[PDB]
Write an enzyme that holds these catalytic residues in place. Structure first.
Site, PDB file in Angstrom:
ATOM      1  N   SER A   1      -6.370  10.454 -13.140  1.00 32.96           N
ATOM      2  CA  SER A   1      -7.280   9.335 -13.437  1.00 32.96           C
ATOM      3  C   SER A   1      -7.511   8.416 -12.239  1.00 32.96           C
ATOM      4  O   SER A   1      -8.649   8.060 -11.932  1.00 32.96           O
ATOM      5  CB  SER A   1      -6.754   8.512 -14.607  1.00 32.96           C
ATOM      6  N   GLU A   2      -6.439   8.005 -11.569  1.00 34.69           N
ATOM      7  CA  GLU A   2      -6.595   7.012 -10.502  1.00 34.69           C
ATOM      8  C   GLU A   2      -7.274   7.582  -9.268  1.00 34.69           C
ATOM      9  O   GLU A   2      -8.061   6.897  -8.622  1.00 34.69           O
ATOM     10  CB  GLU A   2      -5.271   6.345 -10.127  1.00 34.69           C
TER      11      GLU A   2
END
Lengths: 250, 251
Positions: free
Chosen positions: B160-161
């Protein structure tokens, strides 16, 4: 002498990164220190060169000549004549009997003076890259050298500096908008951080090679703003934060 | 559900980056704002979801479930059972009839509490990624949740990041040493800078969407270290310096 090619037409994030990786592979000695490629040693007076052929939007090429020892531009070929920076060692075997000597060295101080522009004010991206290729392709004496120095500022940063630092490569990659079609190409200008990173390549390279337990004997301060500096104290930080990607051999 | 896959075996800088780019392309709504993809609005349907199937060194898989609205993990599947974060709405059509609900949400506060570890102290790289996959593959209740939260911290950051921030992706690819044989995989731990970047995703996303002539209405201060900061004042800097790569739709 090997040749690495890059064509602006159809450039994606992937194709630009693949170009730089190929370039690093061929610049490198094939040995690595702390997982970063080590550039070749300068051996006597032998010239250890590499060609980088670049094509503009109209498929017109120039060829940069890089010194593998420092990954830096020393000359370029345009329309079957070589053009040498003023401090480039002669090499009639490669450059021909009568290449044109430019009046300036490849330091940014010199290039910026001749370009009449600081590199903080010069757009970097694929469109500037193409324009720089076209400008060098078409320039000939006795025209003033202004646009040659300007074009070399663009080229040197988008070939040599990005080869040296994946952190600079990333700024380029972040502006190749290839998730849309047609691909769009945006620009950025280097600021205090990127400029100070460029200046510290030798220092960082040496510290990586001198490091004990991966730790720098002399930690390297890098500007992040006009007011503040961060410290690079180990090889992990140099590799991870700076993206130090080639080492000037110490 | 639409699925994007990644396998640790044979990972190169290129394969990891290709994975993330394909992931961004599927997360994206297609709308572009200042050349950054805009994530979708929440529809309340399965169109909001994306599966990310990840394979460890032995090709044992786990499937993360992402919400396309925020590119964030809401659940995962391991060995034919789904595991839901505590706040994830039930959905028999997606998660089966008997998924297990974890006692924590996906906030870093909750995850770090359960893991008994701040993410500043958790290695990130391809080996941690593989270990996190294996750990989730093998875990089942009622063993304590510690290692589940720890593994999710690793996977959230590396999926995600990095999808949200190319600057974080860069850290990862700088540590995939694929020009040596065998390929080597080095680790780093996220700096105060990386953590502050993660914290500011919504703020940066909103400022990009509200910017006038590319200039932020409210400049965003970011830590680059404990003692040093920079200020992001325009869209170009957000895209270029932060590598902001997906936008949370405002608002």
């Amino acid at each position: 002498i090997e040749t690495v090619e890059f064509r602006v037409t159809g450039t994606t994030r992937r194709s630009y990164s693949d170009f730089l990786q190929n370039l690093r592979n061929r610049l490198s000695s094939g040995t690595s220190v702390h997982d970063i490629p080590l550039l070749p040693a300068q051996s006597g007076s032998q010239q250890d060169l590499l060609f980088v052929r670049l094509f503009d939007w109209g498929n017109r090429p120039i060829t940069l000549v890089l010194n593998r020892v420092n990954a830096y531009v020393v000359a370029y070929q345009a329309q079957n004549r070589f053009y040498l920076l003023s401090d480039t060692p002669a090499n009639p075997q490669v450059y021909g009997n009568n290449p044109h000597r430019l009046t300036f060295t490849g330091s940014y101080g010199a290039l910026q003076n001749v370009a009449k522009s600081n590199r903080e004010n010069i757009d970097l991206g694929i469109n500037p890259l193409a324009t720089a290729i076209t400008t060098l392709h078409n320039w000939s004496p006795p025209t003033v050298e202004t646009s040659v120095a300007r074009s070399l500022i663009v080229l040197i940063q988008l070939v040599s500096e990005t080869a040296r630092f994946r952190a600079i490569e990333q700024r380029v990659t972040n502006n190749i908008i290839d998730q849309v079609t047609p691909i769009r190409y945006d620009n950025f200008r280097p600021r205090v951080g990127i400029i100070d990173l460029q200046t510290n390549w030798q220092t960082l390279s040496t510290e990586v090679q001198r490091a004990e337990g991966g730790r720098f004997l002399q930690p390297v301060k890098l500007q992040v703003s006009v007011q503040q500096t961060v410290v690079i104290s180990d090889v992990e930080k140099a590799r991870t934060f700076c993206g130090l990607a080639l080492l000037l051999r110490w």
